[PDB]
Ligand binder design. Sequence first.
Ligand code: NI
Length: 341
Amino acid sequence: TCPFYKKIPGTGFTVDAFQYGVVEGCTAYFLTHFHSDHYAGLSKHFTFPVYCSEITGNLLKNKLHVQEQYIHPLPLDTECIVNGVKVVLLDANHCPGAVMILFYLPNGTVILHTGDFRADPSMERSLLADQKVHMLYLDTTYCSPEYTFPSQQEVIRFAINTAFEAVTLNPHALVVCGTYSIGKEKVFLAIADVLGSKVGMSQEKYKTLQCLNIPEINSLITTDMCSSLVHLLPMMQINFKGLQSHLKKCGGKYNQILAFRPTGWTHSNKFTRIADVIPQTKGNISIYGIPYSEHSSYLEMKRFVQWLKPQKIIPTVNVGTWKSRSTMEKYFREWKLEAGY
Ligand code: NI
């Protein structure tokens, strides 16, 4: 059964609610982004209206084969009427195609659902500037002060400099990058660009990337692994055994691998600055874990919420334990007393 924090009161609407069968009273199902925990349930057999971005729509059609007649793509930054209710989709600064949804309820209440997001000061100059929000449904993935990490720009600077230095010292090194979902494409794109290479990958991953409206993509990726010195592999293969095995397949072209495992936050962020990061090494294989986040840090989250000044907050992440729920409620009250709303 569909939980409360996925229902939008006073509408026929749900958000990221595809794993509960037919939801009673739902006339339109919104999908914030193409991550599996959120789309869980959609397929070619789905026959209700799905509302989403253009990019999410391309992924639904080509990867899950949802029929075209039930996909309703909406433009961003544009007031749209759905089943008699005004809605707006806004860029979430998460993975490609990810949105926040603003709902203007018939009774005058305004609701913002962030989906998954990485809060940024640029959001303070979207269509959010213009008006009040009564209820915020918030991505609280990293809602505690221990969760610190660098900007995406600093992380990419570290990865480009690391890869360019290695391959210039050794022209016979291969670079490998792990993936298991969409998002974080800047990691492997920026490395390939500095090295003058296309990125090589499986047919299944190439298909996924071709749905993402990235400019000049045909110039950046390929399924011809032999032509490429930056390869993508599933994230489960980013270990010494999986990498050894991959190097065997490359026909004596390479004599070293440098690999990257983009993660979220890890507890080494407590102690070690991005500049000071070192790899794990065995023989001619080295593996870097790099903290490239597509979710708000605690400080980014706090800034956003203190700017927006919502009347009520409903968390959408870490909701399963009493200790998590209590911790989150404490921080929301500090933020409110500090800022005066
Ligand atoms: Ni996500």
